[PDB]
Design a protein around this ligand. Structure first.
Ligand SMILES: [Mn+2]
Ligand SMILES: [Mn+2]
Lengths: 106, 562, 261
């Protein structure tokens, strides 16, 4: 019963998830930073938002609080953390429960 | 300003909802501070930039605006030329502009200028057209229809008024100012007595607010004091005053009205203000320090809006007028808004450039020859056309009647004397009217009563056949009001997409080799486009643009015209 | 003394003498010169601050301008001049200030403002209610914004009120039509100031400056942050003890402002 999915990540893993999502018939949403304005994954989702127009390099895929805010604004249902950013971050999966967003992991 | 803070504001929109129009009006008369209406999204650019300002420019400040005018009375943001000019030159849906602003700015009344006879269109329409258009208007966010008639003919106002009470929005009824109540020699007709009488009548037709539309900035300082004096005492409607600053005397006029107890004034931010636009709200704000009453607003915010619009104006320098200093001859000829300039882009444009001092004079003379009329749209066009015609044809006041039988008077004037703009205050002179219509009967009744109601249903089937499938009611009255133009809006949209989404500089100039632009299409869907090169034209003049668009090489073919 | 001597011989009848810092002591030399020529000398007070606002200045209060007027009148000026060089003399304040000055000196009063706030006509309208003697105005097409109020608009603004503005509007229009064309020859020299600017009420730059301190700011790195140049301009002025800002005291505050950002 998932309709809107958001990938909290970039690059190949993100493109991989959208592809699955697509095939499950689930709208996707991608996030990017300032320096990924031109990253391929950016263009593979249905929608795409900039995390932290305020924020920096690879501490932009690490901002729990902003990403959850992007997710809520797109009426997101799940977040798939891919691998090696927030994928193992205990705190992140919790603020996801709180907000109604199913964290796709353990 | 965050969309969430805005949600938290409760201004005059909220108040309409709470207490209705009846109730909004009363609340106005309560307040002690001068309430203000902003004209930056409408009259101000209509005067200074040929009404070319585009949706995108307004939506970008929508949210800072909703904050700055949190306590203002309304935002005038639709009506006038905007309807026509959006579809036509700008090639964008006025309705989307309204819709989008409405969501961006949820706390402040939206105001538009309704032409009593034909709304927003360009000819006469049967009444069910007026009604449909007002129905859909009020459905989309307008809360205050300022209804004026171009000859102050109360009768032609009754219908648009009836349409407004039906949607339970605010109905602003409009006297247009002419002549000079300070000066007994100027008119036997347009005298303090006329306005008071004419105000009382309007109150009876049940309008909520009485508005004075000084469309040519003719309303001198003392006269505003006098005029607003008597009005505030002959009627219990709140008074809402609109001048232009074309004499240079606008603030002074407003400062005067304020003392007499005006209720709301129309103003513009500094950088969109001045000359043929409204007075500058910034300026008035400080001007009032030290006197009893004060403007209700956020200057520190306004100075900020001013700065925005200062820059955006730049994007439009191609449509600036050449009016660059105030002009007091406007007191002799009473030409409204642009005309003084416009009429000149016309008189050289057929070789009397060296005799415009004659044309401005004939303008004055033709007015009186028409028995001294109120000169707004389109009545101002009629006078303008006669003036041209008569100078061009070595014509005078007596010889228009002698040689009339063998003169092609312009369609604008034959149409006037035919009853088709409506009925002039003083009636028509019989012998002039005769020489002008060469037989043709005149209407005996507002041009409205004469016409089969439109069949809105034959229109849908016509428009649904032609286009896609989904046609709205806005598509319909848009077609009805502007058939030829609306058809064209639709060719373009099909060809080029939704242009209103572009930024003004790209709308007007395109791209330069090397440049990367971004268009926000929908929420989180945007186009990033880079123009890499344009090649050299080929065997038959077809250049090859090299783009990149979203990580994708792309090639477009365009017809050059050497 | 030489300059005043040749100037008076050459044609010039009225010398409006002003000091960049209202320092009366410094106006003594030019004054004597003029009197010796037997010409007219106006002693000028330059305006700053805001007599309407008691927290704008401990110093430039209404008693401060009266005391000065009286001081100048003692020095034997023929005419008192109010030089409102930044367009700062708000309409209400014009009324009090001219009113107070009239009943505190017998000198006639000659008022000069700039329409850079868009409130100059009001400021005259009011000065006139209070009884000003002479005002500076310009022909319509050479007026407004950082110039003086248009005499033409003023002519009509006074319809209906007690005092008339003594002049020929028919001829004035003719003159204005003239300077329309003529001004067209000078278009490479126009400012960009194309509308009123109320922020003068915070920073106080006299007529030109703001538009010439904005080039400057941009020659340097500062261009993208006149936002600071202006803000500092105010503060430098307070840092320097709250000074009158005309030529050249205004250059001073300008330079220091650039320097500091
Ligand atoms: Mn108007
Ligand atoms: Mn000066």
């Amino acid at each position: 019963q998932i309709k809107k999915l958001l990938v909290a990540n970039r690059g190949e893993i993100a493109i991989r998830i959208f592809r699955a999502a697509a095939e499950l018939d689930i709208s996707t949403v991608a996030i990017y930073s300032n320096e990924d304005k031109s990253s391929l994954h950016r263009y593979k989702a249905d929608e795409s938002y900039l995390v932290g127009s305020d924020l920096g390099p690879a501490e932009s895929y690490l901002n729990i609080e902003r990403i959850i805010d992007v997710a809520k604004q797109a009426n997101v249902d799940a977040i798939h953390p891919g691998y090696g950013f927030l994928s193992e971050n205990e705190q992140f999966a919790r603020r996801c429960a709180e907000e109604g967003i199913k964290f796709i992991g353990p | 300003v965050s969309s969430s803070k805005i949600a938290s504001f409760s201004g005059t929109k909220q108040l309409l909802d709470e207490v209705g129009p009846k109730g909004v009006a009363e609340w106005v008369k309560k307040q002690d501070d001068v309430l203000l209406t902003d004209t930056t999204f409408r009259d101000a650019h209509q005067s200074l930039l040929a009404t070319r300002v585009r949706t995108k420019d307004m939506i970008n400040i929508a949210s800072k605006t909703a904050d700055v005018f949190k306590d203002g009375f309304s935002l005038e943001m639709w009506g006038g030329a905007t309807f026509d000019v959006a579809y036509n030159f700008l090639k964008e849906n006025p309705w989307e502009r309204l819709e989008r602003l409405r969501k961006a700015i949820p706390n402040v009344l939206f105001q538009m200028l309704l032409r009593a006879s034909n709304a927003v269109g360009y000819k006469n329409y049967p009444d069910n057209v007026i009604h449909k258009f007002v129905q859909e208007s009020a459905k989309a966010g307008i809360d205050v229809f300022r209804i004026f008639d171009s000859l102050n003919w109360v009768d032609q106002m009754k219908v648009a008024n009836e349409a407004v009470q039906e949607a339970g929005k605010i109905s602003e009824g409009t006297i247009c100012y002419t002549g000079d109540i300070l000066n007994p020699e100027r008119s036997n007709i347009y005298t303090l007595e006329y306005y008071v009488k004419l105000a009382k009548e309007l109150e009876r037709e049940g309008f909520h607010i009485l508005a004075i539309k000084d469309m040519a900035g003719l309303l001198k300082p003392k006269a505003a004091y006098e005029l607003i004096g008597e009005l505030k005492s002959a009627v219990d409607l709140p008074i809402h005053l609109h001048t232009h600053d074309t004499s240079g005397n606008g603030l002074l006029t407003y400062k005067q009205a304020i003392d007499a107890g005006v209720d709301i004034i129309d103003t513009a931010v500094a950088s969109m203000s001045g000359l043929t636009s409204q007075p500058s709200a910034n300026s008035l704000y400080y001007a009032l320090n030290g006197f009893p009453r004060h403007l209700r607003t956020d200057i520190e915010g306004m100075e900020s809006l001013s700065h925005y619009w200062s820059t955006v104006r730049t994007y439009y320098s191609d449509f600036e007028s050449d009016i660059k200093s105030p002009n007091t001859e406007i007191y002799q000829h009473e030409m409204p808004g642009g005309q003084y300039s416009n009429l000149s882009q016309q008189a050289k444009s057929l070789g009397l450039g060296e005799r415009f001092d004659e044309v401005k004079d004939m303008y004055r003379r033709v007015n009186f020859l028409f028995g001294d009329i109120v000169k707004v749209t389109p009545s101002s066009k009629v006078v303008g056309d006669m003036a041209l015609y008569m100078v061009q044809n070595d014509l005078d006041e007596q010889s228009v009647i002698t040689d009339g039988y063998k003169l092609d008077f312009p369609e604008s004037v034959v149409s006037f004397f035919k009853g088709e703009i409506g009925q002039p205050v003083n009636g028509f002179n019989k012998d002039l009217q005769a020489v002008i219509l060469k037989g043709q009967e005149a209407l005996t009744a507002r041009p409205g009563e004469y016409l089969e109601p439109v069949d809105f249903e034959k229109v849908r089937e016509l428009l649904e056949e032609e286009q896609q499938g989904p046609v709205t009611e806005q598509d319909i009255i848009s077609y009805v009001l502007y058939p030829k133009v609306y058809e064209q809006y639709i060719q373009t949209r099909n060809q080029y997409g939704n242009l209103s989404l572009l930024d003004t500089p790209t709308f007007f100039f395109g791209m330069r080799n090397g440049e990367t632009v971004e268009i926000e299409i929908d929420k989180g869907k945007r186009l990033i486009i880079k123009l890499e090169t344009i090649s050299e034209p080929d065997e038959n003049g077809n250049r090859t643009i090299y783009y990149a668009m979203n990580g994708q090489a792309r090639r477009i073919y365009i017809k050059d015209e050497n």
